[PDB]
Enzyme design. Structure first.
Site, PDB file in Angstrom:
ATOM      1  N   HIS A 115       0.830  -1.204   0.000  1.00 18.24           N
ATOM      2  CA  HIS A 115       0.000   0.000   0.000  1.00 18.24           C
ATOM      3  C   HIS A 115       0.864   1.255   0.000  1.00 18.24           C
ATOM      4  O   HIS A 115       0.766   2.105  -0.901  1.00 18.24           O
ATOM      5  CB  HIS A 115      -0.919  -0.089   1.238  1.00 18.24           C
ATOM      6  CG  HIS A 115      -1.634   1.174   1.630  1.00 18.24           C
ATOM      7  ND1 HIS A 115      -3.008   1.282   1.584  1.00 18.24           N
ATOM      8  CD2 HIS A 115      -1.189   2.338   2.169  1.00 18.24           C
ATOM      9  CE1 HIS A 115      -3.373   2.476   2.019  1.00 18.24           C
ATOM     10  NE2 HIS A 115      -2.288   3.136   2.380  1.00 18.24           N
ATOM     11  N   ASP A 134       9.489  19.969 -27.615  1.00 14.50           N
ATOM     12  CA  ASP A 134       9.670  18.639 -27.048  1.00 14.50           C
ATOM     13  C   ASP A 134      10.562  18.755 -25.816  1.00 14.50           C
ATOM     14  O   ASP A 134      10.987  19.848 -25.432  1.00 14.50           O
ATOM     15  CB  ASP A 134      10.273  17.683 -28.084  1.00 14.50           C
ATOM     16  CG  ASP A 134       9.880  16.238 -27.848  1.00 14.50           C
ATOM     17  OD1 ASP A 134       9.415  15.922 -26.732  1.00 14.50           O
ATOM     18  OD2 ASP A 134      10.042  15.417 -28.775  1.00 14.50           O
ATOM     19  N   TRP A 193       6.120   1.371   5.483  1.00 16.10           N
ATOM     20  CA  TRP A 193       6.581   2.316   4.467  1.00 16.10           C
ATOM     21  C   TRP A 193       8.083   2.518   4.548  1.00 16.10           C
ATOM     22  O   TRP A 193       8.781   2.514   3.528  1.00 16.10           O
ATOM     23  CB  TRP A 193       5.888   3.664   4.641  1.00 16.10           C
ATOM     24  CG  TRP A 193       6.344   4.661   3.630  1.00 16.10           C
ATOM     25  CD1 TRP A 193       6.169   4.596   2.280  1.00 16.10           C
ATOM     26  CD2 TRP A 193       7.078   5.863   3.881  1.00 16.10           C
ATOM     27  NE1 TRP A 193       6.736   5.690   1.674  1.00 16.10           N
ATOM     28  CE2 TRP A 193       7.302   6.483   2.636  1.00 16.10           C
ATOM     29  CE3 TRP A 193       7.562   6.478   5.037  1.00 16.10           C
ATOM     30  CZ2 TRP A 193       7.988   7.688   2.515  1.00 16.10           C
ATOM     31  CZ3 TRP A 193       8.243   7.674   4.915  1.00 16.10           C
ATOM     32  CH2 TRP A 193       8.450   8.266   3.665  1.00 16.10           C
ATOM     33  N   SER A 244      14.763   6.532 -11.764  1.00 16.81           N
ATOM     34  CA  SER A 244      13.682   7.100 -12.562  1.00 16.81           C
ATOM     35  C   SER A 244      13.442   8.557 -12.197  1.00 16.81           C
ATOM     36  O   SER A 244      13.391   9.433 -13.069  1.00 16.81           O
ATOM     37  CB  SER A 244      12.413   6.272 -12.344  1.00 16.81           C
ATOM     38  OG  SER A 244      11.284   6.842 -12.975  1.00 16.81           O
ATOM     39  N   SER A 245      13.337   8.833 -10.898  1.00 17.90           N
ATOM     40  CA  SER A 245      13.119  10.198 -10.434  1.00 17.90           C
ATOM     41  C   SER A 245      14.328  11.095 -10.695  1.00 17.90           C
ATOM     42  O   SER A 245      14.158  12.282 -10.990  1.00 17.90           O
ATOM     43  CB  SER A 245      12.759  10.168  -8.956  1.00 17.90           C
ATOM     44  OG  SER A 245      13.764   9.476  -8.253  1.00 17.90           O
ATOM     45  N   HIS A 252      10.972  13.944   4.356  1.00 17.09           N
ATOM     46  CA  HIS A 252      10.188  15.175   4.307  1.00 17.09           C
ATOM     47  C   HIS A 252      10.410  15.992   3.029  1.00 17.09           C
ATOM     48  O   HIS A 252       9.452  16.616   2.552  1.00 17.09           O
ATOM     49  CB  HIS A 252      10.413  16.063   5.529  1.00 17.09           C
ATOM     50  CG  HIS A 252       9.358  17.110   5.680  1.00 17.09           C
ATOM     51  ND1 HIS A 252       8.224  16.917   6.438  1.00 17.09           N
ATOM     52  CD2 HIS A 252       9.230  18.335   5.116  1.00 17.09           C
ATOM     53  CE1 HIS A 252       7.460  17.992   6.362  1.00 17.09           C
ATOM     54  NE2 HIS A 252       8.045  18.866   5.563  1.00 17.09           N
ATOM     55  N   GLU A 294      10.762  14.533   0.164  1.00 16.88           N
ATOM     56  CA  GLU A 294       9.881  13.779  -0.725  1.00 16.88           C
ATOM     57  C   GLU A 294       8.417  14.074  -0.424  1.00 16.88           C
ATOM     58  O   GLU A 294       7.583  14.073  -1.333  1.00 16.88           O
ATOM     59  CB  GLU A 294      10.182  12.283  -0.602  1.00 16.88           C
ATOM     60  CG  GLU A 294       9.560  11.395  -1.677  1.00 16.88           C
ATOM     61  CD  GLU A 294       8.150  10.948  -1.353  1.00 16.88           C
ATOM     62  OE1 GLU A 294       7.814  10.855  -0.155  1.00 16.88           O
ATOM     63  OE2 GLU A 294       7.385  10.677  -2.301  1.00 16.88           O
ATOM     64  N   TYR A 310       7.363  17.099   0.504  1.00 15.98           N
ATOM     65  CA  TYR A 310       7.018  18.350  -0.155  1.00 15.98           C
ATOM     66  C   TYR A 310       7.057  18.222  -1.676  1.00 15.98           C
ATOM     67  O   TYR A 310       6.365  18.980  -2.366  1.00 15.98           O
ATOM     68  CB  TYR A 310       7.906  19.470   0.383  1.00 15.98           C
ATOM     69  CG  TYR A 310       7.512  19.834   1.806  1.00 15.98           C
ATOM     70  CD1 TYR A 310       6.359  20.561   2.058  1.00 15.98           C
ATOM     71  CD2 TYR A 310       8.267  19.414   2.893  1.00 15.98           C
ATOM     72  CE1 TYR A 310       5.982  20.883   3.349  1.00 15.98           C
ATOM     73  CE2 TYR A 310       7.895  19.721   4.199  1.00 15.98           C
ATOM     74  CZ  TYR A 310       6.753  20.462   4.414  1.00 15.98           C
ATOM     75  OH  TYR A 310       6.371  20.788   5.694  1.00 15.98           O
ATOM     76  N   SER A 354      -3.517  26.142  -8.132  1.00 17.46           N
ATOM     77  CA  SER A 354      -3.551  27.578  -8.359  1.00 17.46           C
ATOM     78  C   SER A 354      -3.976  27.885  -9.784  1.00 17.46           C
ATOM     79  O   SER A 354      -4.769  28.807 -10.014  1.00 17.46           O
ATOM     80  CB  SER A 354      -2.185  28.187  -8.058  1.00 17.46           C
ATOM     81  OG  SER A 354      -1.716  27.772  -6.788  1.00 17.46           O
ATOM     82  N   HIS A 413      11.253  16.389  12.399  1.00 19.30           N
ATOM     83  CA  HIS A 413       9.981  16.543  13.090  1.00 19.30           C
ATOM     84  C   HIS A 413       9.351  15.197  13.405  1.00 19.30           C
ATOM     85  O   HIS A 413       8.474  15.121  14.270  1.00 19.30           O
ATOM     86  CB  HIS A 413       9.021  17.388  12.258  1.00 19.30           C
ATOM     87  CG  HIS A 413       8.703  16.803  10.920  1.00 19.30           C
ATOM     88  ND1 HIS A 413       9.606  16.783   9.878  1.00 19.30           N
ATOM     89  CD2 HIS A 413       7.577  16.218  10.453  1.00 19.30           C
ATOM     90  CE1 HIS A 413       9.047  16.210   8.827  1.00 19.30           C
ATOM     91  NE2 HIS A 413       7.815  15.861   9.150  1.00 19.30           N
ATOM     92  N   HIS A 414       9.779  14.137  12.722  1.00 20.47           N
ATOM     93  CA  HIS A 414       9.427  12.777  13.095  1.00 20.47           C
ATOM     94  C   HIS A 414      10.285  12.251  14.238  1.00 20.47           C
ATOM     95  O   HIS A 414      10.038  11.140  14.716  1.00 20.47           O
ATOM     96  CB  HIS A 414       9.561  11.849  11.883  1.00 20.47           C
ATOM     97  CG  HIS A 414       9.124  12.469  10.590  1.00 20.47           C
ATOM     98  ND1 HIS A 414       7.804  12.524  10.199  1.00 20.47           N
ATOM     99  CD2 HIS A 414       9.835  13.050   9.596  1.00 20.47           C
ATOM    100  CE1 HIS A 414       7.720  13.119   9.021  1.00 20.47           C
ATOM    101  NE2 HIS A 414       8.938  13.447   8.633  1.00 20.47           N
ATOM    102  N   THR A 466       3.070  28.072   3.884  1.00 15.75           N
ATOM    103  CA  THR A 466       1.856  27.343   3.533  1.00 15.75           C
ATOM    104  C   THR A 466       0.621  28.194   3.806  1.00 15.75           C
ATOM    105  O   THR A 466      -0.340  28.181   3.027  1.00 15.75           O
ATOM    106  CB  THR A 466       1.794  26.029   4.306  1.00 15.75           C
ATOM    107  OG1 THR A 466       1.852  26.301   5.710  1.00 15.75           O
ATOM    108  CG2 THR A 466       2.967  25.141   3.925  1.00 15.75           C
ATOM    109  N   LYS A 490       0.443  30.584   1.118  1.00  9.85           N
ATOM    110  CA  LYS A 490      -0.131  29.897  -0.035  1.00  9.85           C
ATOM    111  C   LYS A 490      -1.653  29.839   0.041  1.00  9.85           C
ATOM    112  O   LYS A 490      -2.342  30.067  -0.960  1.00  9.85           O
ATOM    113  CB  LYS A 490       0.457  28.487  -0.112  1.00  9.85           C
ATOM    114  CG  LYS A 490       0.219  27.750  -1.406  1.00  9.85           C
ATOM    115  CD  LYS A 490       0.919  28.435  -2.546  1.00  9.85           C
ATOM    116  CE  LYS A 490       2.425  28.465  -2.364  1.00  9.85           C
ATOM    117  NZ  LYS A 490       3.050  29.419  -3.318  1.00  9.85           N
ATOM    118  N   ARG A 541       0.165   2.662  15.156  1.00 11.07           N
ATOM    119  CA  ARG A 541      -0.050   2.275  13.772  1.00 11.07           C
ATOM    120  C   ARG A 541       0.383   0.828  13.548  1.00 11.07           C
ATOM    121  O   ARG A 541       0.888   0.154  14.452  1.00 11.07           O
ATOM    122  CB  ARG A 541       0.706   3.212  12.832  1.00 11.07           C
ATOM    123  CG  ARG A 541       0.111   4.599  12.734  1.00 11.07           C
ATOM    124  CD  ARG A 541       1.093   5.607  12.147  1.00 11.07           C
ATOM    125  NE  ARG A 541       1.385   5.387  10.738  1.00 11.07           N
ATOM    126  CZ  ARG A 541       2.292   6.070  10.052  1.00 11.07           C
ATOM    127  NH1 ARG A 541       3.012   7.025  10.619  1.00 11.07           N
ATOM    128  NH2 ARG A 541       2.488   5.784   8.770  1.00 11.07           N
TER     129      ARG A 541
END
Ligand SMILES: CCCCCCCCCCCCCCCCCC(=O)OCC(COC(=O)CCCCCCCCCCCCCCCCC)OC(=O)CCCCCCCCCCCCCCCCC
Ligand code: HEA
Ligand code: HEA
Ligand SMILES: CCCCCCCCCCCCCCCCCC(=O)OC[C@H](COP(=O)(O)OCCN)OC(=O)CCCCCCCCCCCCCCCCC
Ligand SMILES: CCCCCCCCCCCCCCCCCC(=O)OC[C@H](COP(=O)(O)OCCN)OC(=O)CCCCCCCCCCCCCCCCC
Ligand SMILES: CCCCCCCCCCCCCCCCCC(=O)OC[C@H](COP(=O)(O)OCCN)OC(=O)CCCCCCCCCCCCCCCCC
Ligand SMILES: CCCCCCCCCCCCCCCCCC(=O)OC[C@H](COP(=O)(O)OCCN)OC(=O)CCCCCCCCCCCCCCCCC
Ligand SMILES: CCCCCCCCCCCCCCCCCC(=O)OC[C@H](COP(=O)(O)OCCN)OC(=O)CCCCCCCCCCCCCCCCC
Ligand code: CUA
Ligand SMILES: [Cu+2]
Ligand code: NA
Lengths: 139, 48, 227, 54, 46, 72, 44, 514, 103, 93, 85
Positions: free
Chosen positions: H61, H91, H126, H156-157, H240, H242, H244, H255, H290-291, H316, H319, H438
């Site tokens: 998941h 292109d 995860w 890939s990324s 973190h 990743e 954002y 937007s 923060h974790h 944020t 935003k 969890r």
């Protein structure tokens, strides 16, 4: 073939006057009323007024920005497939899920009820607070 | 001259009765144990 | 212990946890302020029949639009730094007790005098005593006295766990090869329920921590009563 | 050899740039497609036998 | 040259509604059922 | 016969400023309602618990249940 | 966004066929595995 | 011919189409995994018996909906579709590594399914915490298959990020600078920067955990001097940024769609908009711990990181206020995608506010690895990001196909998500307040109410994705074409028609001399 | 200020070389502003529409003023009641009796 | 020596762009265009080969939204917000 | 005919070759680390070496024998290089 070339009609109140007309093709009597429109303005009657308006542009605001029943039918569809979802719940409860654990019998939930009341579990606001230990009954 | 003049109210009424019927069915007719709060009306008894 | 239809969090037992839930409720009416703002703005914003699609200037909102979030977050963060000060406050080490996450279960040690080590497992559903909690009851509950600063010295054997007591509100992460100190104080007797709190295998839900507040005289009677 | 190789390449015949050489480059082309497809079939069958217990 | 147009710039042909229905239903059925077959396979193995 | 001159300009401006004033007042009203509902009742219930609460006597009256592993 | 009328106006029945097909093609696989779970659980 | 056009493709439009179909693949697999989780968690007791399989399907998941559709549409497909169509690029600068990114995605998918097929099963969650993923607790090949699948997704990324920055700077016309262009440029620019500056730490982490496992080093094993906190620190230093990455392209597209459907010719506060974007990108690196509020870190570091999370919460809010300022005072035409936008802004707002509550440090100490954290990221990315995804997907569907999508079914669907995800994930809020950890398959009896009502909400999400499969079918069936689109003067991407042709921007965009 | 705003608008609408495209541009960017337009501005627009014969665009900007009146419908009676001499010397009627106010 | 120069080594599109550079011409949009003139008698000229062309006007200084539209071979058309004129001319062979 | 100063990249199967080559290489590493095979490793290493070999041969062919590398593209290539490094 492609028509993004010529500017396209789109009637909305944000851009209330589009650059292009609605019916560009104009008949013989329509040309006659257009040149009469170019002539003096004192000899024009209501039906040709509204027909020249409707042939040059499509709609007017006071009849296009109307609240229809689209919200009614989409909330009806939303809670209609909510009903189908409940039917899916019925199917999977009947066939997929097995028995409950024995930890949910009425006598057994009474057993743990007496247990955490005897423990005064979260007795400030949560569970034991709503119980009286003097008359032994819920507040 | 559209779909929402009369079919819209037909769909909302039919979906209303269908969904409320099947959700009262799911809430009551099966009898799944929700494990509701036993405050107020549910009473315990003694154990060792 | 958690009760059915639980709306808020667990009721506090430790004074540090009553402070923590006070700060929690502070953050709660702050978030209800800003949620009410965004809902009222969005409602009376969509229900407007007026349009303004001209070049409205944007270099006139910076100072207020950045100082109001700054001040609201700084008065959020000042109790956070203050409660971190009460996280790292000076301890009076009245008692210590060690725990190890053994492989899917727990172990507890009182090694101050007449060293004691014991193992705690999960009492199975079929072997449950009539009238005990499901997935929580333990054959050997860890027992601690009244109103004493006691440090949990946590570690783990072969996989990291987390000693987690939400009814004291502390969860601390038992890394293997690394013991961490977490002080606890309480003021009310009885059983207090928790779990371990990181993924560590195929019985992860099946490992609780049940902690028994007793007076210290009866605690030392207990300690003499095992051995 | 750059200008003669250049006029060897730009015949404007429309075949893509990896087929400018002739028979040896399609030779390597065909053998690389064959070996990579054989490799990925052998990977998928190896993963399938790894999935199945003994 | 490549020929373009609405719908035909997609890897699956949109020449017939029933055939497109059959292809989409079998493809998305396999996609939805793949992890079901996975979890079935490990509970067979266990 | 005749009509006075109403507002032509700034209409949405005054509408938005009175509505954000309403937003601020309804936000503080929501927070005050939440406070008076649940927040200071926590402080209160802790206070009437702990001003007369005796933890040792609490320990005996769940100790006659005979439940404690350390207290037989 | 102005759009031309549906080139293929799906009839009342046609829409139902597509809707049912999607629901059936999704529920059957899941239900099938779930239905045999009892025999699956049993380790032979 | 087909093998030349679609296998051997070197055009960004068809690579984006392939990205979209692979994302639909992975999204359906992921929602089936979530339904396996929810059906196991519907009733007290164990549906699957052993919950090692539960751990395998929850980590599947997590992997499939963190790595396999969110970048493929939201960064990959939407990016390589629209970025040339709004810059003016004919292109990609780097289409062969656009093709690296796309065509190494399914090897990563297949290695993930192979990890599932491994007898051991990679039940680690995860994150890939040692020594849970170590040589003793998880002695098997599944963790290595996950590691190599994440290797392929990572490279890939990387190649996608290199292509995206090279296109986002190089393809631009020279007279227009980076501050003369709308928000797709800045959005995918800052996210590709975050990819490039975050992913090598993840690659490093999986490499030295890989050699911890197979060829026997002692980087994380405390019996010979290793430390799991090393992998912890570096993996969240990835995680973190990743995160954002998972939140910013949604900001850009949301937007744009708010500006479009509010009728605004120009998004308000554009300088502040892009300033908030670069502030989030520049500051998201140093907020990773923060974790770490309960592992045993120093309180000076904890105070610094919670202050930094307040400071990253500031733009944020800039935003959100910018979004409302864009929405202010316009002809508000009720498109379905605008409803998706309203749902995104409100529910992402409350999710981020719950995250601020989490980043209060002692609140994290009481609420670490708890269902309240689930309630956080399940309002934020599971639904906020995908509401942005469907908003864009139904916004540019004529650009993607040439046909329109049915608005009635679309807004009825926005309703069906709306009720479903509220009744799914607000109960988790209740559960996290109650406080269970969890990664649990069986729960104490007091959680049955919220657990069951979240199960009903998840089945609501099932019939919702059924409506997706249905409406894409009926849109392809009706195949009705547009005649006119609004705001094509300010929207370059709509100028070539629906869909854009094979060779677009053969003559590049003429620009004012100024 | 608003005085020179309206002055430049009326000079823009009363320039002799006006045509339909640029008056369309000016009217659209006037609608984009956050203001109910001045009756003098509407008067100048009606003179321009008289000059190049646009009945339908003139009644369109009239109903634009009508929908720009907002939630309160007293602004449009004011606008028309200064516009009565202008309408009956151009001969133009408004949709409220020529039949476009309704559906 | 031995190192070759551009005029003997660089070929193809390099040859057209380099000879165009040494004559000081830009036929493939390597550099932003010139001859800004928004007036009636002197419109903004756009070179092309085809009937059809994309323009994007930054038609006010330091602008956010580029005003994109389509030029056709024919009468001069202007920006719909600022008013800079445009013609197309077919000579970019 | 093209008018932009950018290289139009023709269709190539080299992405497919490199993708399945990388998949073969990853499968080789895990297969060796868990089941002691060498042949799949040899296949994977050879197919990566050749894949980059005639991939970069194609790159040089379109670069110096075609002259598609306009200096805009060249500075974009330098941008890609500095970002990679
Ligand atoms: C050209 C002339 C016709 C050639 C044969 C076409 C059919 C077989 C084929 O090779 O078909 C081509 C393949 C292409 O798929 C792949 O190659 C799978 C890669 C993984 O089709 C599939 O396998 C199945 C696709 C099913 C429908 C998917 C709908 C997705 C909707 C959501 C995204 C919309 C994006 C809009 C944009
Ligand atoms: C897109 C995904 C996304 C986003 C945006 C965020 C945003 C944030 N996240 Fe979250 N987070 C995750 C995805 C995300 N997170 C995931 C997946 C995890 C799980 C990791 C794990 O498994 O351990 C996680 C975990 C996580 C934790 C772990 C808790 C634990 O240890 O168990 C914490 C705590 O600090 C946290 C904090 C935050 C904060 C403070 C923000 C902020 O950036 C929120 C900003 C967004 C807003 C909308 C701000 C709202 C504020 C305003 C609108 C201003 C107005 C307010 C006032 C004026 C008061 N996140
Ligand atoms: C994007 C990521 C994502 C998404 C959508 C979801 C969606 C859901 N998740 Fe998610 N979840 C995670 C990421 C995600 N989750 C992660 C990262 C974890 C942590 C794992 C761990 O514990 O280690 C987690 C953990 C997690 C748990 C763990 C709790 C525990 O075990 O203790 C649970 C159980 O309730 C859960 C439930 C759900 C449910 C019920 C949904 C539902 O919302 C399902 C609905 C989903 C959709 C509807 C998808 C929409 C997509 C499309 C419709 C396709 C779009 C494509 C195109 C248009 C082309 N999730
Ligand atoms: C549980 C929540 C379910 C929410 C379902 C929302 C369905 C919205 C349907 C719709 O399109 O509503 C638009 C409609 C007005 O649209 P229209 O008729 O075009 O306007 C002309 C005059 N009003 O009607 C409205 O604008 C009123 C309803 C708006 C609902 C917005 C919900 C946002 C979340
Ligand atoms: C949507 C609003 C924004 C998100 C809020 C998420 C937090 C939340 O809803 O927490 C539940 C909150 C606190 O629960 P509490 O009132 O303390 O319960 C014990 C005494 N009743 O409980 C409440 O606020 C009351 C119940 C929910 C009302 C909505
Ligand atoms: C007074 C100090 C205080 O705590 O006020 C609470 C609130 C204003 O909030 P404050 O603490 O000033 O800072 C923002 C964070 N709540 O202030 C309030 O909630 C105001 C309470 C009094 C007025 C209530 C009006 C209710 C109207 C219905
Ligand atoms: C039930 C499935 C079959 C429905 C057949 C039917 O009545 O079709 C007519 C209509 C077709 O949809 P249509 O009205 O064209 O689209 C909505 C406008 N946006 O159908 C609908 O609009 C949906 C009718 C749903 C009835 C339940
Ligand atoms: C293993 C990955 C290897 C990546 C690589 O070498 O890519 C080759 C690529 C070829 O150049 P490219 O710009 O794609 O050519 C077409 C347009 N002239 O090279 C480039 O685009 C420039 C170098 C990119 C390096 C990426 C390495 C990963
Ligand atoms: Cu031990 Cu989880
Ligand atoms: Cu983070
Ligand atoms: Na379960």
């Amino acid at each position: 073939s492609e028509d993004y070339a010529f500017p396209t009609y789109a009637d909305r109140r944000d851009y209330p006057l589009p650059d292009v007309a609605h019916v560009t093709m104009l008949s013989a009597s329509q040309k006659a009323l257009k040149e009469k429109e170019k002539a003096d303005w004192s000899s024009l009657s209501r039906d040709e007024k509204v027909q020249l308006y409707r042939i040059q542009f499509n709609e007017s605001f006071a009849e296009m920005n109307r609240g229809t029943n689209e919200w009614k039918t989409v909330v009806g569809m939303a809670m209609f497939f909510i009903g189908f979802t409940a039917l899916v719940l019925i199917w999977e409860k009947s066939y997929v899920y097995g028995p409950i654990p024995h930890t949910f019998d009425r006598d057994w939930v009474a057993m743990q009820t007496k247990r955490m009341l005897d423990m005064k579990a979260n007795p400030i606001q949560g569970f034991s607070a709503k119980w009286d230990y003097d008359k032994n009954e819920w507040k | 001259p559209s779909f929402h003049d009369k079919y819209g109210n037909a769909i909302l009424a039919g979906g209303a009765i269908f969904c409320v019927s099947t959700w009262t069915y799911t809430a009551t007719q099966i009898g799944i144990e929700w494990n509701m709060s036993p405050v107020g009306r549910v009473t315990p008894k003694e154990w060792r | 212990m958690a009760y059915p239809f639980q709306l808020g969090l667990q009721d506090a037992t430790s004074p540090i946890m009553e402070e923590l839930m006070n700060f929690h409720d502070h953050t709660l009416m702050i978030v209800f302020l800003i949620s009410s703002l965004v809902l009222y703005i969005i409602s009376l914003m969509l229900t407007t029949k007026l349009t303004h699609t001209s070049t409205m200037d944007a270099q006139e909102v910076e100072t207020i639009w950045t100082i109001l979030p700054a001040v609201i977050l700084i008065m959020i963060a000042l109790p956070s730094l203050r409660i971190l000060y009460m996280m790292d406050e000076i301890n009076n080490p009245v008692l210590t007790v060690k725990t190890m996450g053994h492989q899917w279960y727990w172990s507890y040690e009182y090694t101050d005098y007449e060293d004691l080590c014991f193992d705690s497992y999960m009492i199975p559903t079929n072997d449950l005593k009539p009238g005990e909690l499901r997935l929580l009851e333990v054959d050997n509950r860890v027992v601690l006295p009244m109103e004493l600063p006691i440090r949990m010295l946590i570690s783990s054997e072969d996989v990291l766990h987390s000693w987690a007591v939400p009814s004291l509100g502390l969860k601390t992460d038992a890394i293997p090869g690394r013991l961490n100190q977490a002080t606890v104080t309480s003021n009310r007797p009885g059983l207090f329920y928790g779990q371990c709190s990181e993924i560590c295998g195929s019985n992860h839900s099946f490992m609780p921590i049940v902690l028994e507040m007793v007076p210290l005289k009866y605690f030392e009677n207990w300690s003499a009563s095992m051995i | 050899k750059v200008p003669e190789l250049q006029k060897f390449f730009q015949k404007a015949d429309g075949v893509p740039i990896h087929l400018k050489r002739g028979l040896p480059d399609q030779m390597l082309y065909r053998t690389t497609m064959a070996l990579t497809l054989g490799g990925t079939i052998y990977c998928l069958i190896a993963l399938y036998m790894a999935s199945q217990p003994r | 040259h490549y020929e373009e147009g609405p719908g035909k710039n997609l890897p699956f042909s949109v020449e017939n509604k029933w055939r497109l229905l059959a292809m989409m239903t079998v493809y998305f059925g396999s996609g939805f059922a793949a992890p079901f077959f996975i979890v079935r396979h490990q509970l067979l193995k266990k | 016969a005749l009509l006075p001159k109403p507002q032509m300009r700034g209409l949405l401006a005054k509408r938005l400023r009175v509505h954000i004033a309403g937003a601020f007042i309804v936000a503080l009203g929501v927070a005050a309602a939440y406070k008076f509902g649940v927040a200071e009742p926590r402080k209160k219930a802790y206070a009437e618990f702990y001003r007369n609460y005796d933890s040792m006597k609490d320990f005996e009256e769940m100790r006659k249940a005979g439940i404690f592993q350390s207290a037989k | 966004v102005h759009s031309k009328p549906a080139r293929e106006q799906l009839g009342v029945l046609d829409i139902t066929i597509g809707l049912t097909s999607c629901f059936v093609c999704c529920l059957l696989p899941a239900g099938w595995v779930l239905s045999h779970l009892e025999s699956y659980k049993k380790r032979e | 011919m087909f093998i030349n056009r679609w296998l051997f493709s070197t055009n960004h439009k068809d690579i984006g189409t392939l990205y979209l179909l692979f994302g639909a693949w992975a999204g359906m697999v992921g929602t089936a995994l979530s339904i396996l989780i929810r059906a196991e968690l519907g009733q007290p007791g164990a549906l699957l018996g052993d919950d090692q399989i539960y751990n395998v399907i929850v980590t599947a998941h997590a992997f499939v909906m963190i790595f396999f559709m969110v970048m493929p549409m939201m960064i990959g497909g939407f990016g390589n579709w629209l970025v040339p169509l709004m810059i003016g690029a004919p292109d990609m600068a780097f289409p062969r590594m656009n093709n690296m990114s796309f065509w190494l995605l399914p090897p990563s998918f297949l290695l993930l399914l192979a990890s599932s097929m491994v007898e051991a099963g990679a039940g680690t969650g995860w994150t890939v915490y040692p020594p849970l993923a170590g040589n003793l607790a998880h002695a098997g090949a599944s963790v290595d298959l996950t590691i190599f699948s994440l290797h392929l997704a990572g490279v890939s990324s990387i190649l996608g990020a290199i292509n995206f920055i090279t296109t986002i700077i190089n393809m631009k016309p020279p007279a227009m600078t980076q501050y003369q262009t709308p928000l797709f440029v800045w959005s995918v620019l800052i996210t590709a920067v975050l990819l490039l500056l975050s992913l090598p730490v993840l690659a490093a982490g999986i490499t030295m955990l890989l050699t911890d496992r197979n060829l026997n080093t002692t980087f994380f094993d405390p019996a010979g001097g290793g430390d799991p906190i090393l992998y912890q620190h570096l993996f969240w230093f990835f995680g973190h940024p990743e995160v954002y990455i998972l939140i910013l392209p949604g900001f850009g597209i949301i937007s744009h769609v708010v500006t479009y459907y509010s009728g605004k010719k120009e998004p308000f506060g554009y300088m502040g908009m892009v300033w908030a974007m670069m502030s989030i990108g520049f500051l998201g690196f140093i907020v990773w711990a923060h974790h770490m509020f309960t592992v045993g870190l120093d309180v000076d570091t904890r105070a610094y990181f919670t202050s930094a999370t307040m400071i990253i919460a500031i733009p944020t809010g800039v935003k959100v206020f910018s979004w409302l300022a864009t929405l202010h005072g316009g002809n508000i035409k009720w498109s379905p995608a605008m409803l998706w936008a309203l749902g995104f802004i409100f529910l992402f707002t409350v999710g981020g506010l719950t995250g601020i509550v989490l980043s209060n440090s002692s609140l994290d100490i009481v609420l670490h690895d708890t269902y309240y954290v689930v309630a956080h990221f399940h309002y934020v990315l599971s639904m906020g990001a995908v509401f942005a995804i469907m908003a864009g997907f139904v916004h540019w569907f004529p650009l993607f196909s040439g046909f329109t999508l049915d608005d009635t079914w679309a807004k009825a669907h926005f309703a069906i998500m709306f009720v479903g995800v509220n009744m799914t994930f607000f109960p988790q809020h209740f559960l996290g307040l109650s406080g269970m950890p969890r990664r649990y398959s069986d729960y104490p009896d007091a959680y049955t109410t919220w657990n069951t009502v979240s199960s009903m909400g998840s089945f609501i999400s099932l019939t919702a994705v059924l409506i997706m499969i249905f409406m894409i079918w009926e849109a392809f069936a009706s195949k009705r074409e547009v005649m006119s689109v609004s705001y094509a003067s300010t929207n370059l991407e709509w100028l070539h028609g629906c869909p854009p042709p094979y060779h677009t921007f053969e003559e590049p965009t003429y620009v004012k001399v100024k | 200020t608003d005085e020179e705003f309206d002055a430049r608008w009326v000079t823009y609408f009363n320039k002799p070389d006006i045509d339909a495209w640029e008056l369309r541009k000016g009217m659209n960017t006037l609608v984009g502003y956050d203001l109910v337009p001045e009756p003098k501005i509407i008067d100048a627009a009606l003179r321009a529409c008289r000059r190049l014969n646009d009945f339908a665009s003139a009644v369109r900007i009239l109903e634009v003023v009508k929908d720009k009146a907002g939630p309160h419908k007293e602004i449009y009676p004011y606008v028309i009641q200064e516009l009565r001499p202008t309408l009956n010397e151009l001969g133009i009627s408004t949709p409220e009796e020529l039949g476009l106010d309704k559906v | 020596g031995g190192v070759p120069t551009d005029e003997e080594q660089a070929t193809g599109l390099e040859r057209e762009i380099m000879i165009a550079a040494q004559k000081g011409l830009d036929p493939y949009n390597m550099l932003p265009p010139k001859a800004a003139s928004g007036t009636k008698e002197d419109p903004n000229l756009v070179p092309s080969i085809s009937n059809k062309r994309i323009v994007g006007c930054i038609c006010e200084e330091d602008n956010c939204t580029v005003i994109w539209f389509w030029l056709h071979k024919g009468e001069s058309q202007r920006c719909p917000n600022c008013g800079t004129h445009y013609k197309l001319v077919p000579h970019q062979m | 005919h093209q008018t932009h100063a950018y290289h139009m990249v023709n269709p190539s199967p080299w992405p497919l070759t490199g993708a399945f080559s990388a998949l073969l290489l990853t499968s080789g590493l895990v297969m060796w680390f868990h089941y002691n095979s060498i042949t799949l490793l040899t296949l994977g290493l050879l197919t990566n070496i050749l894949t980059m070999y005639q991939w970069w041969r194609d790159v040089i062919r379109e670069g110096t024998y075609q002259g598609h590398h306009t200096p805009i593209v060249q500075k974009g290539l330098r941008y890609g290089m500095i970002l990679f490094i």
